Write an enzyme that holds these catalytic residues in place. Structure first.
Site, PDB file in Angstrom:
ATOM      1  N   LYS A  31      57.749 -55.541 -10.817  1.00 22.39           N
ATOM      2  CA  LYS A  31      56.814 -54.930 -11.916  1.00 22.39           C
ATOM      3  C   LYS A  31      56.057 -53.666 -11.778  1.00 22.39           C
ATOM      4  CE  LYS A  31      55.547 -59.519 -13.975  1.00 22.39           C
ATOM      5  NZ  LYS A  31      54.313 -59.951 -14.435  1.00 22.39           N
TER       6      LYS A  31
HETATM    7  C1  LIG Z   1      48.915 -60.010 -12.983  1.00 22.85           C
HETATM    8  N1  LIG Z   1      48.165 -59.241 -14.013  1.00 22.85           N
HETATM    9  C2  LIG Z   1      47.259 -59.758 -14.672  1.00 22.85           C
HETATM   10  N2  LIG Z   1      46.757 -58.840 -15.550  1.00 22.85           N
HETATM   11  C3  LIG Z   1      47.473 -57.693 -15.157  1.00 22.85           C
HETATM   12  C4  LIG Z   1      48.216 -58.006 -14.016  1.00 22.85           C
HETATM   13  C5  LIG Z   1      49.058 -57.071 -13.262  1.00 22.85           C
HETATM   14  C6  LIG Z   1      49.304 -55.702 -13.710  1.00 22.85           C
HETATM   15  N3  LIG Z   1      48.068 -54.964 -13.608  1.00 22.85           N
HETATM   16  C7  LIG Z   1      47.852 -53.916 -12.395  1.00 22.85           C
HETATM   17  C8  LIG Z   1      46.445 -53.559 -12.038  1.00 22.85           C
HETATM   18  C9  LIG Z   1      45.672 -54.528 -11.446  1.00 22.85           C
HETATM   19  C10 LIG Z   1      44.442 -54.356 -11.105  1.00 22.85           C
HETATM   20  C11 LIG Z   1      43.681 -53.178 -11.781  1.00 22.85           C
HETATM   21  C12 LIG Z   1      42.251 -52.972 -11.170  1.00 22.85           C
HETATM   22  N4  LIG Z   1      41.469 -52.594 -11.047  1.00 22.85           N
HETATM   23  C13 LIG Z   1      44.564 -52.276 -12.431  1.00 22.85           C
HETATM   24  C14 LIG Z   1      45.921 -52.539 -12.576  1.00 22.85           C
HETATM   25  C15 LIG Z   1      49.790 -55.505 -14.932  1.00 22.85           C
HETATM   26  O1  LIG Z   1      50.510 -56.521 -15.669  1.00 22.85           O
HETATM   27  N5  LIG Z   1      50.284 -54.365 -15.619  1.00 22.85           N
HETATM   28  C16 LIG Z   1      51.583 -54.097 -15.632  1.00 22.85           C
HETATM   29  C17 LIG Z   1      51.896 -52.933 -16.715  1.00 22.85           C
HETATM   30  C18 LIG Z   1      50.958 -51.926 -17.179  1.00 22.85           C
HETATM   31  C19 LIG Z   1      51.239 -51.019 -17.851  1.00 22.85           C
HETATM   32  N6  LIG Z   1      51.720 -50.030 -18.415  1.00 22.85           N
HETATM   33  C20 LIG Z   1      49.756 -52.266 -16.643  1.00 22.85           C
HETATM   34  C21 LIG Z   1      48.678 -51.120 -17.047  1.00 22.85           C
HETATM   35  C22 LIG Z   1      48.096 -51.087 -18.430  1.00 22.85           C
HETATM   36  C23 LIG Z   1      47.302 -50.102 -18.599  1.00 22.85           C
HETATM   37  C24 LIG Z   1      46.773 -49.167 -17.533  1.00 22.85           C
HETATM   38  C25 LIG Z   1      47.201 -49.277 -16.305  1.00 22.85           C
HETATM   39  C26 LIG Z   1      46.791 -48.271 -15.354  1.00 22.85           C
HETATM   40  C27 LIG Z   1      47.164 -48.563 -13.996  1.00 22.85           C
HETATM   41  C28 LIG Z   1      48.076 -49.568 -13.637  1.00 22.85           C
HETATM   42  C29 LIG Z   1      48.533 -50.443 -14.732  1.00 22.85           C
HETATM   43  C30 LIG Z   1      48.014 -50.413 -15.903  1.00 22.85           C
HETATM   44  C31 LIG Z   1      49.180 -53.574 -16.092  1.00 22.85           C
HETATM   45  C1  LIG Z   2      47.308 -46.918 -22.665  1.00 23.62           C
HETATM   46  C2  LIG Z   2      48.260 -48.069 -21.768  1.00 23.62           C
HETATM   47  C3  LIG Z   2      48.657 -47.457 -20.527  1.00 23.62           C
HETATM   48  C4  LIG Z   2      48.523 -49.370 -22.226  1.00 23.62           C
HETATM   49  C5  LIG Z   2      49.110 -50.233 -21.290  1.00 23.62           C
HETATM   50  C6  LIG Z   2      49.389 -51.511 -22.218  1.00 23.62           C
HETATM   51  C7  LIG Z   2      50.088 -52.661 -21.162  1.00 23.62           C
HETATM   52  C8  LIG Z   2      49.210 -53.845 -20.641  1.00 23.62           C
HETATM   53  C9  LIG Z   2      51.372 -52.616 -20.831  1.00 23.62           C
HETATM   54  C10 LIG Z   2      52.023 -53.623 -20.194  1.00 23.62           C
HETATM   55  C11 LIG Z   2      53.241 -53.252 -19.500  1.00 23.62           C
HETATM   56  C12 LIG Z   2      54.211 -54.387 -19.190  1.00 23.62           C
HETATM   57  C13 LIG Z   2      55.749 -54.108 -19.544  1.00 23.62           C
HETATM   58  C14 LIG Z   2      53.717 -55.325 -18.540  1.00 23.62           C
HETATM   59  C15 LIG Z   2      54.842 -56.651 -17.845  1.00 23.62           C
HETATM   60  O1  LIG Z   2      55.200 -56.348 -16.644  1.00 23.62           O
HETATM   61  P1  LIG Z   2      53.743 -58.111 -18.356  1.00 23.62           P
HETATM   62  O2  LIG Z   2      53.834 -58.574 -19.807  1.00 23.62           O
HETATM   63  O3  LIG Z   2      54.321 -59.147 -17.397  1.00 23.62           O
HETATM   64  O4  LIG Z   2      52.294 -57.869 -17.922  1.00 23.62           O
END
Ligand SMILES: Cn1cncc1C[C@H](NCc1ccc(C#N)cc1)C(=O)N1CCC(C#N)=C(c2cccc3ccccc23)C1
Ligand SMILES: CC(C)CCC[C@@H](C)CCCC(C)C[C@@H](O)P(=O)(O)O
Ligand SMILES: [Zn+2]
Lengths: 312, 401
Positions: free
Chosen positions: A110
């Site tokens: 992921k």
């Molecule tokens: C298992 N889970 C449930 N909710 C989120 C997740 C995992 C993952 N998040 C990563 C994360 C964990 C802890 C913190 C803190 N503090 C920050 C980020 C997730 O599902 N995603 C995947 C795709 C995605 C995307 N795009 C994410 C995301 C969205 C927006 C801003 C971000 C900034 C940094 C890292 C990830 C993100 C989060």
């Molecule tokens: C402004 C932003 C960076 C927004 C990010 C929004 C998101 C939460 C995007 C999540 C990305 C993906 C594909 C997550 C998947 O792995 P899941 O649906 O399992 O969490």
């Protein structure tokens, strides 16, 4: 060369082949904010990364170090970048690197950087031969990894590998008919190969989908699929539709049957039909049932469809 | 409470006796949630929904200063930690010390790249996610100093450096492409007023290709509708003033279908589970869709509420997504973090506050001390900081060249 997990792992500072270099520490400023207390190990590898990078030392030892830096924080896109530079510069065996990224993705499926890195290698190599098999292994551990499906669509699109994907979709739909990623994939595939204009195909699809509905009536995906493949031509251009669905009223009912009917009615109105007055009454009653009894979580939406159904 | 009612128990999952890996998991969350709901009945107390604002404030207040090695995994997302914390505090109406705000400003300055944009920490290559975050942070503070950290002439260079012929942008040089890049660029470029005439050329069209058969938007054209990507797409189009490039009807049916009848909170994808962060990514799409629809003069629109159950979403969050020790979370059992803290709160605020011109029907669940400051449904920063920032940068000329 030396595992971060090995019982006999030694800090870079304690390393003989890493004494010519001075570890460049992180500069968070005299007054830090959201400051992470790294482990002696995390700080050690990175103080050394800041240096090799800062020197732009494009060396084999630098290469082996990004590996440790990546394991400490695979989400560090800057390290992933310098590693691709080393891949080109040091002229590294990319297939060997395909194996590396393969293992890393198995570990962090992921992570955004790992999938992208893999896509870069496949492009460099112009070799999509291992892709569908690798992806399928990841989708075997998590049938809905978004990154896996996305990467998959890219391999299929780019390399035009469409022939056996519908057979795959059918396989996964057999495993979990509620797998929306697969319903989406089935659309991706058909709409890019034959399309839904072909009467036989359209029929085959609606049939199959009416099946999955008259099998797991409360599975939303099949409903959004059936609606999706027909709503793009007019549900009302399908007379038999309203009937067969009306037949499922007591045998396969859910607020999806009601919501679909509210959708047909909407279109038999857009297109104007005799009995339209009764049609509008039936449709608004359904809107109130869904809104008041059948599906109240979205009572704001359902009454709004009642009010729009008034004006138009 | 809508949730603790006896008829709400009929909103439980209909398995059809055809159980799949999806039924199973959904049913599992439902039971853990039922417990929380019935929490009251079993213990013989009267239900009192309260936002552990002090416990949350002490959590946030600490993380703005330092994190354990457990946060080594977000070592490339530091401007995000500033934004999440500085926005949760912002919604909890808590203080941002004239000294801490400066350090934040000083730190972000260290994150900023000489090529424009921001990295995940001092010395990291600029990336649009950290850039979006840094800019939002700087605006939440909102002072000549903070605003002045942002190099606008370099930010345009950078934005242009990622721009793709098909209308999409890369997230970073040599990096991936997906809708986040479009929203990130649009949000920072608009706020700082650097939008030239051809900057987002063809961008609305690419974003519209991400909308699929579900009514929702995916990461890239062809992909499954996803809540975080749909927020990026819609919000990006609202900024570009092109919401209309989409089929708003179906997008509406899709988003509204994402709220869990039994849990009250939202899911990111059809047939997935509820998750507190989606209280904002998905629920935030209705205010966006209110404007949009009313913009094309829609009559059937409410003058007091959003097209989702505001009550149910507030119960879900208050009852199920709050950590005793402080911080919010995905769902019961899940661990706490600043991302869910920032998004459960942002969603609570969306749910508590309605608007529609001069209409103002706030809905505060439980203790009225539970009401949060407002947040802008496009930038996800206080509507006042938004207004204050745009106008301040508006007295600067777009970096014309
Ligand atoms: C298992 N889970 C449930 N909710 C989120 C997740 C995992 C993952 N998040 C990563 C994360 C964990 C802890 C913190 C803190 N503090 C920050 C980020 C997730 O599902 N995603 C995947 C795709 C995605 C995307 N795009 C994410 C995301 C969205 C927006 C801003 C971000 C900034 C940094 C890292 C990830 C993100 C989060
Ligand atoms: C402004 C932003 C960076 C927004 C990010 C929004 C998101 C939460 C995007 C999540 C990305 C993906 C594909 C997550 C998947 O792995 P899941 O649906 O399992 O969490
Ligand atoms: Zn979440």
């Amino acid at each position: 060369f030396l595992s971060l997990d090995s019982p006999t792992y030694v800090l870079y500072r304690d390393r003989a082949e890493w004494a010519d270099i001075d570890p460049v520490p992180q500069n968070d400023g005299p007054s830090p904010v959201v400051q992470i207390i790294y482990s002696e190990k995390f700080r050690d590898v990175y103080d050394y990364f800041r240096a090799v990078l800062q020197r732009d030392e494009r060396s084999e030892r630098a290469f082996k170090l990004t590996r440790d830096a990546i394991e400490l924080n695979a989400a560090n896109y800057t390290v992933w970048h310098f590693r691709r530079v080393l891949l080109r510069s040091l002229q590294k065996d990319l297939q060997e690197e395909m194996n590396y990224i393969t293992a890393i993705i198995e570990e962090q499926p992921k992570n955004y950087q790992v999938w992208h890195h893999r896509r870069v290698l496949v492009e460099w190599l112009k070799d999509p031969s291992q892709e569908l098999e690798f992806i399928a292994d990841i989708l075997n551990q998590d049938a809905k990894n978004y990154h896996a499906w996305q990467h998959r669509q890219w391999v299929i699109q780019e390399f035009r590998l469409w022939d056996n994907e519908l057979q795959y979709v059918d396989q996964l739909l057999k495993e979990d008919v509620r797998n929306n990623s697969v319903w989406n994939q089935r659309h991706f595939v058909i709409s890019n190969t034959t399309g839904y204009s072909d009467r036989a195909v359209l029929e085959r699809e609606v049939q199959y989908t009416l099946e999955m509905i008259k099998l797991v009536p409360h599975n939303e995906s099949a409903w959004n699929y059936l609606k999706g493949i027909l709503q793009d031509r007019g549900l009302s251009r399908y007379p038999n539709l309203l009937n067969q669905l009306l037949d499922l009223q007591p045998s396969h009912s859910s607020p999806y049957l009601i919501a679909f009917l509210v959708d047909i009615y909407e279109d038999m109105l857009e297109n104007q039909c005799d009995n339209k007055e009764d049609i509008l009454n039936k449709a608004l009653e359904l809107c109130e049932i869904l809104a008041k009894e059948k599906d109240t979580i979205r009572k704001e939406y359902w009454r709004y469809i009642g009010r729009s159904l008034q004006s138009k | 409470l809508y949730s603790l009612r006896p008829e709400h128990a009929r909103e439980r999952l209909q398995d059809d006796s055809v159980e799949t890996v999806t039924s199973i998991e959904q049913a599992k969350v439902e039971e853990k949630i039922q417990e929380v709901f019935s929490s009251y009945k079993f213990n013989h107390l009267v239900p009192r929904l309260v936002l552990q604002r002090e416990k949350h404030f002490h959590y946030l207040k600490r993380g703005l200063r330092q994190l354990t090695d457990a946060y080594e995994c977000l070592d490339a997302s530091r401007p995000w930690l500033c934004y999440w914390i500085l926005h949760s505090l912002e919604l909890l109406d808590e203080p941002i010390p004239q000294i801490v705000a400066t350090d934040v400003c000083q730190f972000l300055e260290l994150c900023q790249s000489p090529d424009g944009g921001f990295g995940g920490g001092p010395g990291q290559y600029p990336h649009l996610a950290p850039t979006y975050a840094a800019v939002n942070a700087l605006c939440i503070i909102g002072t000549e100093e903070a605003y002045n950290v942002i190099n606008r002439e370099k930010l345009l260079q950078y934005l242009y450096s990622l721009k793709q012929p098909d209308g999409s942008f890369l997230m970073h040089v040599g990096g991936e492409v997906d809708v986040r890049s479009a929203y990130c660029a649009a949000s920072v470029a608009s706020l700082t007023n650097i939008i030239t005439p051809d900057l987002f050329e063809g961008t609305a069209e690419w974003i519209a290709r991400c909308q699929n058969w579900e009514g929702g938007i995916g990461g890239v054209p062809g992909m499954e509708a996803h809540g975080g990507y749909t927020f990026c797409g819609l919000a990006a189009l609202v900024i570009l003033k092109k919401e209309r490039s989409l089929n708003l009807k179906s997008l509406l049916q899709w988003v509204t279908s994402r709220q869990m009848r039994f849990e009250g909170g939202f899911q990111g994808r059809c047939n997935k589970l509820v998750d507190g962060c989606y209280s904002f990514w998905q629920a935030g799409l209705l205010p966006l869709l209110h404007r949009a629809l009313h913009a094309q003069g829609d009559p059937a629109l409410s003058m007091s509420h959003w097209m989702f159950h505001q009550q149910a979403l507030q119960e879900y969050i208050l009852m199920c997504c709050q950590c005793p020790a402080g911080g919010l979370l995905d769902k019961p059992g899940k661990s706490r973090d600043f991302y869910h803290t920032c998004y459960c709160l942002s969603g609570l605020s969306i749910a508590q506050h309605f608007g529609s011109g001069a209409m103002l029907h706030d809905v505060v669940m439980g203790v009225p001390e539970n009401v949060l400051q407002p947040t802008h449904p496009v930038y996800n920063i206080g509507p006042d900081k938004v207004i204050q920032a745009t106008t301040h940068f508006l007295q600067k000329p777009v970096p014309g060249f």
